[PDB]
Design a protein around this ligand. Structure first.
Ligand SMILES: CCCCCCCCCCCCCCCCCC(=O)OC[C@H](COP(=O)([O-])OCC[N+](C)(C)C)OC(=O)CCCCCCCCCCCCCCCCC
Ligand SMILES: CCCCCCCCCCCCCCCCCC(=O)OC[C@H](COP(=O)([O-])OCC[N+](C)(C)C)OC(=O)CCCCCCCCCCCCCCCCC
Ligand SMILES: CCCCCCCCCCCCCCCCCC(=O)OC[C@H](COP(=O)(O)OCCN)OC(=O)CCCCCCCCCCCCCCCCC
Ligand SMILES: CCCCCCCCCCCCCCCCCC(=O)OC[C@H](COP(=O)(O)OCCN)OC(=O)CCCCCCCCCCCCCCCCC
Ligand SMILES: CCCCCCCCCCCCCCCCCC(=O)OC[C@H](COP(=O)(O)OCCN)OC(=O)CCCCCCCCCCCCCCCCC
Ligand SMILES: CCCCCCCCCCCCCCCCCC(=O)OC[C@H](COP(=O)(O)OCCN)OC(=O)CCCCCCCCCCCCCCCCC
Lengths: 104, 344, 67, 318, 114, 115, 83, 98, 171
């Protein structure tokens, strides 16, 4: 910040909930704690332009814990195949994917 | 106005930047633009005439849409890489629509058509707050995004603010519509050098604030919003002509005066970053930003326009000019060129 | 005299007991003699969707006797 | 088996409301020393059927200067809502339990306004524009208080679920902790539910049949079906939020049976009012309710915040 | 790029309790006293190792001590236990606040025996 | 889903009750009973002109407080925080500045029906 | 006094609403400061185990509560009972 | 979630497309400015509610305390546009360009 | 069921489309009480029941003023709203055909995944809480009083100053 009168006083006016993994209300978690943590403990003291090329594994993962996109095409390519495979057959769905199973 | 209302509105103005400054979240940093948006309107409208209302509506509707177009880019960024900051790898049109909106808060390329209309139809006090203090918090959005601005559109908004703030300032007799288009010209210098060492745009702001504030306060002294009214000043307070000749020939940057410093060392940062062909288009048009100051100091100083005899009473009644606010801000500018290394 | 009002009340008075006493007997019939078993939190829904999976698909039954 | 519960939830309130039209004409009568209906049935028990079956035969006025779309939707929107507010209303176990079962009331209580605004705005007439406007400054008056008089009670209860109060009142009525709230609640149950000593909106004597004058019989009943249906809610809540009847869960029909005994009084208490007091002139009601109740509200709103933390009385979030 | 390595359908086959919540809430406070060393070590793996497939065997003992907990109910003090949850499940939120008489009747039966 | 079973009904209970009101009265609509009322005369103006209210300032103070009411509503959960001393104070600070904001308007003639 | 204390007497006769409001305001913040039981609100509210208490692992240290719940060590609130 | 936000972003834009093309009313542009806010309430709540970012759940109200306080200052200027003209047409305020 | 929120979402886009055509402020206000209600559905379709109701409490008492002033400032002799011309009714029907066009365009380009009409309804909650308690919204909004008590002073001050900022505009 410009005119950073928060570090100068030390107090956390509002810099303690900027991101997801940040002191949830009682004890909850924000669905990507494991990844944002691994992203931001990586990008500390290396700041900025070198948090953008070497700490790319942690963002490429956190960009998929959060958006969760590649799991869709990996779960839409399934349907596209099965919907194509069946309808011309060659596939008999089991009991536990068309209903009847033994729940636990 | 009632002091219990004044202090509250002189204080929300003191919160807008200061919360846009002392806050990393782009939500605290958003509301700061609004405290500076609520508070201004009650004092735009102190006379409640058909000139104050039309400005406030033209100041509000023009500038709440911008607060939304900002706030979109946060939420579009609150989804992508979930947090409340433009981190490094945010998408472009999130920010090129952010910078879009700031340019409406400030008024640059075609987003300038509201500034003079609002800076016209307004008192001189509260002409000084827009062009100097409302301008600090939007830039505080915009220094924090130090890298990671599109170098292409950040720069067409500059040149378009050099042209449109210079071509337009020629026609305009009313000083308030001149100083509006001075703000727009000087912002192409604040705003073109934003990726390129923006310790120079924090400069051009603290210079520009030292130039206008004497001027708007030099017009409070007689409430002259016309060339023909600032002219008849050799009969009222001739002692002021010595500064305005320099306040304007500096605010249009000529070298021995400090207002050439920002226009100059900026170009160094432009030349030094291999944009040899852009800075010229600016500096060739910053000369046109002298023609309606050359012409203006003629009408003011270097040719006594024909005054009134009713003005003979004004040579009896002993005005009072401020202290520490004009003599400082007119010598702390126009005579500080040799201290440029201390500036930068 | 005023006692002619009681028909308007005691027929209105056999008209707002039904949505209270019918709301329970209709629950017990559907819920197996128990109450509706409301779920405000995500835990009480888990117990249902557990108990839904320890029986036939209706969840108002089986407990001990199994192992 | 759920439709058979709605069927036993809406029939026994449209058949009750009907006999509030009757009871609002006899109790008012005997105070006026005049017998009400006695003739169409034994003791007027069969008058609302005439009144009802009378109104669905007359020409629903489609006035020449109006908006026939919002014309028809307001009574559709009035009879819908005030009937649809009985859904979570917990006789011991409700049809639809809800965590925020009372914000459901507040919000849907507010949409009973737009049946009064869209109606009188659609219907081109001065005497209905007013009645629309007469609700605007009425909702503006009490709606600040139907929340805080309703919050500060639910502040020494926990969740907004109406079902919790049966356990909060397991040994005492909340009328005694908060009679100040219950006073202002009663009047705020009386501005909402525009039927009142201060009607101001269906003013027969100022704004003749305001928000309602261009409406003839067909659409007209859907407001009476909604207004006298809403009189019984905002007394049914007082029999839940302030007057807590007996739960004792092996005879749950004791709650519903004492729930009767008090709701009829609070539904028969409104009837003494209309026969006892005139209106507030529409500038007092907003000077009576921003000046006198609003500060007194914020005080007790503040007192019940410092009531549990002072002592220990923290409601649990079950 | 990588694959996910996880068990097979038989590597996680366990005798299910096949028991409902209401009866399970009833014997819970005794299930915290007994069958605690075998349940906390699961958690201590679960929070320390963040993976279902590295804290698998300890789970099988959570569903092995609970059986040995209910096996001691089925032989000793079963009838008064049936009288307890049979009223507790009548409620809509399974409150101990109501079935408080059958609670001591089951606790004295279990204070003496076991 | 269980509520949609309650509330689509009540639209139909209203919508089925309105179709049996327009198509079962035997109407005779011609010209002069459709035209607006004003108590037995032809209305002078057009019924849709500026009303020019007088409680204009109070409608805004409500417009600000409906936020403030909304800004109170999480108190039943806030007491279930572990601090209960900032919730104590900051609940006094919100209610107090309101009454200060309400008492200033109360004296400066805000809720007074300009006339 | 008289010139302040007897002004409250008409303000209690006429305007008998703001006196309650201005009193209950001044009587709300003041009572938690002079209570015996205000300490417990941040404690009765801190005892509730909404989330699961994660156990530590024994490493020859912390002579606290052993691996047994009904063991006299630890935060045994007998103050909530017998309040 | 990635079917509404394209549909809510596209609902923001139409309202941004609405509060730049006027139709002879200042009070329908202020009106179009609140549905603009509203799509940001919802496209902020969901992001703070599929991510379970309860720590950010204070934000969708703080956004909205400045949705009415901005409308309040917005509505109150119409009082001062009407009392000059009494008509509230945007074409009627053009005497600043002079 | 799977097509629940796409319907509530497209009925919102429409509630904000006619809102953008700028009819009279009444049928725009009606256009927002709907879309505000519809916003209470999808906010609630993804969990929290508090936040949805809030919009459906503010923008009822919000649009109750918008009904008041428009009758006094913003209203013609003839409203001329939707069924009154053809300039609006074209770009109210060609906006919706543009909708059914556009969303059906870029399911053919199922590579960016902006809408997946075949993979629809299966990605809405993302692994919430199943065994859990004390999780809903309103616990987060109540952080105004613990750990986020600057959202609280900064918004309260806005309403403290709005009450002064508003009357100086009227006076
Ligand atoms: C209690 C709450 C529920 C409310 C609903 C009440 C249900 C009970 C209603 C039953 C009554 C149904 C018949 C009412 C129709 C009255 C209108 C009428 O007189 O029509 C006469 C007209 C007579 O037509 P006409 O041949 O004499 O000519 C008509 C025009 N004039 C006379 C001017 C030349 O038609 C009917 O006979 C009505 C039959 C309607 C039956 C439809 C079912
Ligand atoms: C995708 C499907 C979603 C709908 C797409 C838009 C098309 C729907 C029709 C909207 C336009 C109709 C119209 O012109 O409205 C003005 C019309 C004007 O009619 P009027 O009231 O002026 O009277 C006309 C009189 N006659 C019949 C003789 C011509 O009124 C309305 O329909 C307003 C109601 C809008 C309905 C939407 C709100 C939902 C219900 C609220 C609860
Ligand atoms: C050094 C190298 C660096 C580069 C140097 C650059 C050049 C210096 C800048 C020059 C520009 C400023 C001078 C131009 C001012 C305009 C002319 C002017 O002010 O005088 C005209 C004015 C006539 O008004 P009149 O009513 O006739 O009264 C006359 C006597 N009272 O006469 C007046 O009344 C005005 C004065 C009345 C009050 C008395 C003050 C006398 C002026 C003192 C300033 C002298 C200049 C300062 C020294 C030079 C600085 C380097
Ligand atoms: C009207 C304004 C027109 C816009 C300016 C167009 C000229 C752009 C100048 C770019 C600098 C340049 O000319 O060459 C690049 C060179 C170093 O850069 P390099 O190594 O080639 O990569 O750098 C240089 O050689 C520096 C050249 C200095 C800048 C030249 C500016 C043009 C001056 C010529 C006209 C001057 C006479 C007056 C006007 C007459 C009409 C043109
Ligand atoms: C004539 C015009 C009529 C149009 C206007 C009609 C207005 C109807 C009344 C307005 C409703 C008020 C707002 C309701 C919000 C939902 C209330 C709520 O918060 O609880 C919903 C509940 C889940 O919440 P909760 O119980 O707290 O979660 C824990 C689990 N027990 O359980 C749920 O999740 C259910 C939530 C969805 C229920 C919404 C009901 C919508 C009804 C359809 C309206 C449109 C009409 C149909 C089209 C016909 C054409 C006009
Ligand atoms: C085509 C999109 C451009 C916008 C359509 C409306 C045309 C327009 O420019 O708006 C002008 C209108 C100005 O107001 P007014 O002065 O009353 O106009 C009188 C003209 N005789 O102002 C307005 O009407 C307000 C405009 C708001 C429009 C919101 C809805 C836009 C939805 C339609 C998008 C275009 C459809 C694209 C179709 C693609 C084909 C596949």
């Amino acid at each position: 910040p410009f005119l950073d009168i928060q570090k100068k006083l030390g107090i956390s006016l509002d810099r303690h909930f900027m991101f997801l993994s940040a002191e949830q209300p009682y004890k909850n978690a924000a669905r990507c704690h494991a990844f944002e943590k691994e992203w931001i403990e990586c990008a500390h003291g290396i700041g900025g332009t070198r948090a953008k090329k070497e700490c790319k594994i942690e963002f490429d993962d956190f960009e998929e814990c959060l958006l969760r996109y590649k799991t869709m095409r990996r779960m839409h390519d399934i349907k596209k195949q099965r919907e194509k495979l069946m309808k011309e057959g060659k596939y008999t769905p089991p009991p536990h994917h068309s209903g009847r199973e033994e729940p636990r | 106005m009632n002091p219990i209302t004044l202090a509250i509105i002189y204080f929300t103005i003191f919160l807008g930047p200061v919360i846009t400054m002392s806050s990393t979240n782009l939500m605290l940093m958003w509301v700061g633009l609004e405290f500076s948006l609520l508070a201004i309107i009650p004092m735009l409208i102190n006379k409640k005439n058909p000139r104050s209302t039309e400005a406030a509506t033209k100041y509000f509707v023009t500038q709440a849409t911008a607060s939304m177009i900002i706030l979109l880019a946060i939420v579009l960024n609150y989804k992508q890489l979930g947090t409340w900051m433009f981190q490094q790898q945010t998408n472009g049109l999130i920010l090129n629509m952010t910078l879009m909106a700031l340019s409406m808060k400030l008024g640059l390329a075609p987003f300038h058509f509201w500034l003079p209309e609002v800076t016209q139809g307004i008192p001189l006090h509260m002409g000084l707050i827009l062009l100097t203090w409302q301008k600090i918090a939007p830039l505080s959005i915009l220094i924090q995004i130090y890298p990671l601005l599109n170098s292409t559109i950040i720069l067409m908004l500059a040149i378009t603010s050099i042209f449109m703030g210079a071509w337009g300032g020629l026609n305009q007799t009313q000083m308030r519509k001149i100083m509006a288009y001075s703000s727009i010209a000087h912002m192409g210098w604040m705003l073109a050098i934003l990726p390129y060492n923006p310790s120079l745009t924090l400069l051009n702001l603290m210079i520009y604030i030292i130039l206008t504030a004497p001027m708007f306060m030099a017009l409070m002294l007689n409430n002259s919003m016309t060339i023909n009214s600032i002219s008849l000043l050799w009969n009222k307070t001739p002692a002021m002509l010595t500064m305005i000749s320099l306040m304007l020939l500096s605010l249009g940057g000529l070298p021995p005066l400090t207002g050439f410093l920002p226009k100059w060392i900026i170009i160094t940062e432009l030349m030094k970053n291999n944009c040899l062909i852009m800075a010229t288009l600016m500096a060739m048009m910053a000369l046109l930003n002298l023609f309606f100051y050359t012409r203006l100091i003629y009408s003011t100083s270097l040719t006594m326009f024909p005054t009134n005899n009713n003005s003979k009473m004004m040579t009896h009644q002993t005005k009072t000019k401020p202290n520490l606010m004009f003599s400082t801000l007119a010598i702390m500018s126009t005579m500080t060129l040799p201290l440029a290394p201390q500036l930068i | 005299m005023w006692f002619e009002i009681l028909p308007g009340l005691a027929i209105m008075g056999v008209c707002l007991v039904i949505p209270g006493v019918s709301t329970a007997y209709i629950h017990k019939f559907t819920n197996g003699g128990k109450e509706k078993r409301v779920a405000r939190v995500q835990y009480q829904w888990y117990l249902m969707e557990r108990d839904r999976r320890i029986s036939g698909v209706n969840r108002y039954y089986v407990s001990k006797g199994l192992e | 088996m759920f439709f058979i519960n709605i069927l036993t939830l809406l029939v026994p309130i449209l058949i009750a409301m009907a006999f509030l039209t009757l009871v609002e004409r006899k109790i008012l009568g005997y105070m006026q020393l005049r017998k009400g209906p006695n003739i169409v049935g034994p003791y007027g028990i069969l008058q609302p059927f005439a009144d009802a079956m009378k109104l669905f035969m007359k020409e629903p006025m489609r006035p020449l200067t109006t908006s026939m779309s919002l014309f028809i939707i307001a009574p559709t929107l009035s009879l819908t809502l005030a009937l649809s507010l009985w859904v979570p209303l917990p006789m011991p176990h409700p049809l639809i339990n809800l965590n925020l079962g009372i914000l459901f009331i507040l919000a849907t209580s507010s949409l009973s306004v737009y049946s009064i605004l869209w109606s009188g705005w659609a219907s081109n007439s001065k005497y209905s524009l007013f009645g629309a406007l007469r609700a605007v400054a009425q909702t503006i008056s009490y709606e600040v208080t139907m929340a805080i008089i309703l919050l500060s009670v639910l502040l020494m209860n926990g969740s907004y679920s109406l079902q919790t109060l049966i356990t909060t009142q397991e040994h005492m009525w909340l009328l005694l902790p908060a009679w100040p709230m219950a006073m202002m609640w009663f009047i705020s149950t009386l501005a909402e539910t525009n039927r009142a000593p201060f009607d101001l909106t269906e003013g027969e004597s100022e704004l003749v049949s305001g928000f309602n004058v261009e409406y003839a019989a067909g659409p007209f009943a859907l407001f009476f079906m909604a207004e006298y249906t809403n009189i019984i809610l905002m007394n049914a809540l007082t029999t839940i939020i302030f007057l807590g009847p007996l739960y004792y869960i092996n005879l749950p029909e004791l709650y519903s049976t004492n729930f009767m005994m008090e709701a009829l009084l609070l539904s028969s208490t409104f009837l003494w009012i209309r026969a006892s007091y005139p209106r507030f002139r529409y500038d007092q009601l907003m000077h009576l309710l921003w000046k006198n109740f609003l500060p007194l509200t914020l005080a007790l709103c503040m007192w019940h915040i410092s009531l549990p933390i002072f002592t220990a009385g923290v409601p649990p979030y079950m | 790029p990588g694959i996910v390595e996880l068990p097979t359908l038989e590597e996680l086959k366990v005798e299910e309790v096949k028991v409902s919540s209401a009866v399970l809430k009833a014997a819970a406070h005794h299930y915290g006293a007994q069958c605690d060393k075998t349940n906390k070590e699961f958690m201590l793996c679960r929070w320390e190792e963040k993976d279902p497939r590295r804290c698998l065997k300890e789970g099988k003992l959570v569903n092995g001590c609970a059986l040995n907990f209910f096996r001691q109910i089925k032989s000793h003090c079963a009838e008064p236990f049936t009288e307890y949850w049979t009223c507790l499940d009548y409620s809509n939120m399974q409150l101990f606040r109501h079935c408080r008489q059958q609670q001591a009747k089951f606790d004295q039966c279990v204070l003496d025996k076991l | 889903m269980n509520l949609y079973t309650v509330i689509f009904i009540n639209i139909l209970l209203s919508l089925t009750l309105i179709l049996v009101a327009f198509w079962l009265p035997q109407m005779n609509l011609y010209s002069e009973k459709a035209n607006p009322y004003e108590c037995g005369f032809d209305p002078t103006s057009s019924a849709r002109l500026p009303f020019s209210m007088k409680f204009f300032l109070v409608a805004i103070t409500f417009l600000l407080f409906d936020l403030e009411i909304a800004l109170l509503l999480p108190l039943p959960w806030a007491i279930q925080t572990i601090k209960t001393s900032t919730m104590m104070i900051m609940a006094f600070i919100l209610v107090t500045i309101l009454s200060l904001g309400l008492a200033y308007e109360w004296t400066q003639k805000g809720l007074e029906w300009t006339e | 006094a008289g010139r302040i204390s007897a002004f409250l007497k008409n303000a209690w006769a006429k305007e008998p609403v703001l006196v309650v409001s201005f009193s209950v305001w001044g009587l709300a913040i003041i009572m938690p400061m002079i209570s015996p039981y205000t300490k417990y609100a941040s404690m009765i509210n801190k005892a509730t185990p909404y989330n699961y208490p994660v156990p530590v692992r024994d490493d020859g240290n912390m002579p606290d509560v052993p691996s047994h719940p009904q063991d006299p060590l630890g935060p045994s609130l007998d103050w909530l009972k017998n309040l | 979630m990635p079917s509404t936000f394209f549909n809510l972003t596209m609902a923001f834009s139409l309202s941004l497309l609405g509060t730049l093309m006027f139709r002879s009313h200042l009070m329908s542009t202020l009106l179009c400015l609140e549905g603009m806010v509203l799509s940001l309430f919802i496209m902020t709540s969901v992001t703070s509610l599929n991510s379970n970012s309860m720590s950010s759940m204070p934000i969708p109200i703080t956004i909205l305390v400045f949705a009415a306080c901005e409308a309040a200052v917005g509505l109150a200027l119409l009082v001062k546009v009407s009392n000059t003209y009494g008509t509230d047409y945007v074409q009627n305020l053009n005497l600043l360009q002079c | 069921m799977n097509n629940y929120i796409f319907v509530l979402s497209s009925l919102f886009l429409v509630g904000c489309l006619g809102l953008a055509l700028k009819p009279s402020p009444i049928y725009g206000g009606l256009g927002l009480i709907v879309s505000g209600f519809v916003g209470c559905l999808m906010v609630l379709g993804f969990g929290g029941s508090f936040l949805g109701l809030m919009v459906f409490l503010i923008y009822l008492g919000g649009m109750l003023v918008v009904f008041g002033y428009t009758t006094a400032m913003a209203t013609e002799e003839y409203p001329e709203t939707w069924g009154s011309n053809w300039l609006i009714l074209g770009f109210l029907v060609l906006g919706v055909i543009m909708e059914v066009f556009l969303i059906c365009v870029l399911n053919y380009y199922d590579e960016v995944g902006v809408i997946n009409l075949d993979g629809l309804g299966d990605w809405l909650m993302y692994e919430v809480d199943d065994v859990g308690v004390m999780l809903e919204g309103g616990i987060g909004v109540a952080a105004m009083y613990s750990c986020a008590t600057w959202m609280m002073v900064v918004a309260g001050w806005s309403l403290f100053a709005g009450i002064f900022i508003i009357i100086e505009i009227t006076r």
